[PDB]
Design a binder for this molecule. Structure first.
Ligand code: MG
Ligand code: MG
Ligand code: MG
Ligand code: MG
Lengths: 359, 359, 358, 358
């Protein structure tokens, strides 16, 4: 199994719900698609979207990194020496985690195909189905509660709500209105996206507790670099605190675990620069009795399939956040995982199970 | 591929150098051999010797654990669901690490055969040859200097010396004599086997470097559960200090790395309960910039072959202590690794490469 | 036991003495190496070199056939029903005999491993050693005779000489110089590689008879499709005539045997699409009292090892042409058969005995 | 895997329905049972009944051949060298095909046990179940018709009928009455046992077509040595003609196939001297597009088990005639194949699968 060709292409898939950034309004989901062709004729697939605010990677930086650094280093190499290939991918350049992840996806796809197994089975095969949460778009508490009940009826028992942008009072009113229409029938996951200061986070999370909102967990309440602050929120509340942006790499996972700064860890391939890193983070957490969740960036079903195969393979990964593909007006890929309500099913073919560009 | 049969047997290979325990004189190397048969026709092999003083495992405890707990839980299981199998092996019972290790060997043997690759390649395939050290048996400094010369003439440039039993003056005199024969033509690794107190170890190690003995590293100078003491020795000497008995599991590795109590870690399958735990230890160590060594207990080529496959696959594993097989009068196994002087070569067929009993 | 992976790799081994074709100059011997891995831990090996002039297969056609046709039909299958697998391999596509043969090699290798026996014993194990001939490169009669004597001293009592390209007189001059030089006991095998017309062949073969050259046999004197002509040469000379290119498959073997168009049959795995067909050809011949020889195309020790295992197993196979690996500057495979002069020895490990790359 | 002991014993199983020969009344099915013991402890089984009219072999000729010729030649031989052993069995003495067959059964039984696989899988494993026809005894048209209907209700959709003994009008009247009872619910195989002259057979078969009897096939219509005659019948009828007594060995199979004298070939281990020859006949036939059937002589489940294993293993063997065991009042063997209506199923243990006496 030798790598003989590496190609990249760009895609732009219209969003069902456009959103605005500080500089513009996004109507499409862009990402770099990677195709690694092996001497066996097999094709490994990878995906990497830009996340200027989270990783700092852009379409241009991702493609350049793949064409100027990773590609010339991977050509001709064989998957028999995987340890060395992964080390080169992670160390030939600093950062550019997204570019590295896209390449790792295609490599693990090739690796699983080589062994004749679905990627998730190659990584441990713990489960073949998993439940994904669904995001309730921010809006008036009344509108969110409406969407929430309808998502509940569609089979989603876990909903995700972004908080930490508006007033704490606004966040709380929204969640209250939501429970008013669904009760405990659904679990509520919040992501503050580093929007609060430590003391401000403790206050808001306790308020929700006093209001008996029963929050399942709160992701990254404080600034990613503020570990001591993240730990303050963890030790001052009864609601589990999940580290997201604070943990990209296994070394950062080790720091968070060592200081006991969080109850849980949210893993994403883009942040870890791929599966190898993601695996190390989860294994590390597991040994410390800390469960993990696997999420993603705005990605098509390709990136979500790689993410899902990794998540499905580990016992210690007990939560999943893979609704990005459901936010696209179209599915441009043939194969991969399949959705039935909130239930994601793993494919049976070797590798990722991605056949090619849909039609 | 499903497990359909699990058998065990005992072997006794006469040692080339019998030694004495507190209760008797040992002439043979005893071990429990495990054979797992898969519905594909594949056979997985594993080994586990008793280590009453190191692990507390005996031939009977090992065999009983395999037949009454591990076996009934593994028969009928599919390797496509490895994660669940590993979890059961490690958690169905406490301790019994050697029994868990023996079963893990045969399990990974089959897993590699199911994916059709030499085990070390399945785990990363970083190198296909490695250099093992050789043990200079304790005796008068004169005889030790002689043996060291012969071993060196045989291709062994790295010698392991057991210290910490007699008084420091005696250890230094032994090491001095050896240097007086081979000079700086060899590297010297010491293993104090918890024989010193922290303050005492610091003094002994400093006296060695003040005598220009040039010790490569010192393994476990203090008691295994005296982490603070191990750390003291680590921060007081310029000689690298390697944790051995202080680290059995990945959780203990985490604690040692977290407190920076040692410069290196010596991994052994019997202590880690197999390869899955050994991988975790190495991965945590690597994330912390700590390299590892892989050693073993008194085992035949089978056990060593399993450990060598794990050791050869990882970049972070840079030292190897696999001379056990060279201490037996007869090699009872066919296949596995091969020795050319101090150079160990990895077999190429799928799995461990062990074909069965010697023909 | 299930097939979990089928892979191919290209190799190019520099020849000790290159040759020219109609389009270029060949400096290396290329081949497609096939590896079939089973979940039992066994790994089967196979080799298929290109032969654009003989079979029509190229490196690309061979590789494509295995990747797009044979591979998808075998992945996931088990060797419980060999009859069905072999049948499917031979009928999934027409021609592409080289691709089919390399896969059959790896399948038989795996099958013998499962049974725990060297492939040659699983097939019959008639002999443990066999004598291979050696080819005397075409040159001046003076130079060929020198090489011949040299091979004779090294232990080769049977030599093969290619004829039918140059003048008949030139062939005779070169052969007569050799026969007189090495002695009449030695056996000289000729391969006319379809270079003569029937009457032209009878004349030449008769001229060597009159010169008392003692030719052991003449391989395929006429065009492979000219069975009537091949038969004419067979019935007009005293020298035995061996069918080669005229016989690829057992059906063709049946045709040659029923018409008695040849005295012997040369079997090659590449031509028969593997060991199953080769085995049927030999069985047919034996039943007709016709002995066979096993040869090969330009292949490394892998392809030769498979050929030798098949050849060594049958009593009716009495001649061997396996010097191809000796024409390579280096041996790239570890294991397989071993050479000791002209003597080839079968290995003792299960299957083909191929360990891997050198 | 070495042969260390070879023993023989005689058995006599009472027939459910005795028959008369040109000299006496037969009430029991007799055969010689061969037991080959190997150094591993494994035991190989073989069987051979006398067929004074078909092969010429008798109980005494068989036992003597085994003890005085085959036994001293096989004692101490290893199955790793199967080819040599098979060559010895087939060539140490001429004829004596039944004795050769019995020994081969016990050898293939051990060979397969050595490889740890059911014999049928070791030979190709094409199918693991097969449909056997059933014999309708010759009697009045009305009685045969009653039997046909009966066997049908038991699951036997394919019936075999012996013809060519009586007048042509009688055979037809019998078959007509059978068609009247079951109609097209069954296939009818006829065996003329060399009872007609070529012209007479052509006439008889065309009359059966005209009568819309729908005959599946006719075995050996003419004398076994009359190949030209056999071919005439083949070419003058639309009904497929099967060679039986005309083909014992692979060489005779070659002659029949070469001349296109028959549409099909019936194989029996006793005629071919075992499985090696049977395998050659079938491979030969398959190459010519000629399908085969496998039947037997009057044998117990042991002999039929060996034949069934061979029949089940090949793709080209598409018809089966194994009702012999069903004609005995007792089954003296434990193991081997098992019946369920007309369906025969292959056992799962290594070799033939018979444990011993019942
Ligand atoms: Mg988040
Ligand atoms: Mg130690
Ligand atoms: Mg030729
Ligand atoms: Mg008949």
């Amino acid at each position: 199994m030798k790598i003989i060709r590496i190609e990249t292409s760009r895609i732009a898939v219209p969003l069902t719900k456009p959103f605005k950034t500080a500089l513009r309004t996004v109507y499409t989901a862009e990402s770099v698609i990677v195709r690694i062709t092996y001497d066996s004729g097999a094709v490994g697939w990878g995906e990497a979207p830009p996340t200027l605010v989270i990783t700092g990677d852009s379409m241009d930086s991702i493609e350049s990194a793949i064409h100027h650094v990773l590609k010339p280093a991977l050509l001709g190499k064989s998957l028999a020496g995987y340890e060395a290939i992964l080390h080169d991918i992670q160390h030939l350049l600093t950062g550019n985690m997204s570019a590295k992840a896209a390449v790792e996806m295609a490599l693990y796809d090739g690796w699983a195909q080589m062994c004749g197994l679905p990627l998730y089975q190659m990584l441990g095969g713990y489960r073949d189905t998993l439940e994904t949460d669904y995001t309730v778009s921010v809006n008036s508490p009344e509108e969110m509660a409406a969407d929430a009940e309808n998502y509940l009826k569609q089979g989603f028992q876990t909903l995700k709500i972004k908080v930490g942008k508006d007033d704490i009072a606004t966040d709380i009113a929204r969640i209250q209105e939501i429970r008013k229409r669904v009760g405990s029938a659904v679990k509520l996951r919040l992501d503050a996206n580093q929007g609060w200061r430590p003391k401000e986070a403790v206050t808001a999370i306790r308020k929700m507790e006093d209001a008996g909102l029963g929050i399942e967990l709160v992701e990254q309440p404080v600034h990613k670099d503020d570990l001591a602050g993240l730990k303050k929120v963890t030790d001052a509340t009864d609601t589990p605190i999940m580290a997201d942006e604070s943990v990209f790499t296994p070394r950062q996972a080790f720091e968070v675990l060592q200081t006991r700064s969080a109850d849980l860890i949210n893993i994403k391939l883009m942040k870890a620069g791929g599966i190898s890193g993601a695996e190390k983070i989860n294994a590390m957490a597991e040994a410390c009795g800390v469960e993990c969740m696997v999420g993603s960036m705005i990605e098509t079903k390709l990136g979500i399939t790689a993410a899902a195969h990794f998540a499905a393979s580990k016992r210690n990964i007990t939560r999943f956040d893979f609704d990005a593909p459901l936010m696209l007006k179209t599915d441009v890929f043939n194969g991969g995982i399949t959705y039935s309500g909130s239930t994601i099913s793993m494919p049976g073919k070797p590798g990722l199970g991605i056949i090619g560009a849909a039609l």
